Design a binder for this molecule. Structure first.
Ligand SMILES: [Mn+2]
Length: 220
């Protein structure tokens, strides 16, 4: 799992307000030029972006197998559900998962993903407290092959021979997938195209990595 994910935002105040309203004050902690949100076992720290930049990312959050429709209703309370092909939800056969989407104030593509066999069945109502963990984060890089190699050296599940430098590459198993790809292409459910912005993350296993502002994946 992702223990800590650090992202940048040009809209810190609006984002603070948005996530405090969505998740509750108990899940959000404000700092001077950053704040954190707790998503189950995962934390995201949003930091002030450099002037003249407007970073955004694609983040999917795991929810229970049996709570996709509740999650979808809940999400729609915070913004208009995104659509693709006139559909306001998606089914992904490869992940056997249902997904729904909204944009936050920075234009982040916030997905709720309900993995039908790779998530728990929770016999209990859905709420902000039932966001399980981070299920997806884009790793948008200036060198996909170099990135894949470093990730495998970091001992992450990478099938090097399958890596497509020009497309999206799913890295992981179970309930967490890093979306490794180049910039350029429009994200599903969004007007926005993949663009390199910096981030860093620490995994549950103690592995930590960074994407520099030029798109280099660097294993910290
Ligand atoms: Mn996704």
């Amino acid at each position: 799992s992702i223990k800590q994910l650090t992202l940048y935002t040009a809209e810190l105040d609006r984002m603070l307000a948005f996530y405090t309203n969505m998740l509750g004050a108990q899940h959000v902690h404000e700092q001077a030029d950053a704040f954190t949100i707790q998503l189950g076992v995962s934390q995201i720290q949003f930091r002030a972006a450099a002037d003249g930049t407007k970073p955004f990312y694609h983040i999917a959050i795991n929810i229970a197998a049996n709570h996709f429709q509740e999650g979808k209703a809940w999400l729609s309370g915070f913004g208009e559900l995104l659509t693709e092909n006139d559909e306001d939800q998606a089914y992904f056969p490869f992940f056997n998962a249902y997904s729904c989407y909204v944009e936050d104030p920075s234009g982040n593509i916030i997905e709720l993903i309900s993995r039908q066999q790779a998530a728990p069945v929770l016999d209990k109502p859905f709420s902000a407290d039932q966001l399980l963990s981070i299920g997806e984060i884009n790793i948008t890089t200036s060198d996909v092959e170099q990135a894949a190699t470093r990730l495998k050296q970091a001992e992450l599940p990478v099938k090097l021979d399958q890596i497509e430098p020009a497309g999206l590459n799913f890295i992981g198993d179970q309930d967490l997938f890093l979306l490794l790809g180049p910039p350029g292409r429009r994200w599903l459910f969004s007007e926005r195209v993949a663009v390199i912005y910096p981030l860093q993350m620490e995994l549950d296993n103690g592995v930590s990595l960074a994407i520099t502002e030029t798109g280099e994946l660097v294993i910290l």
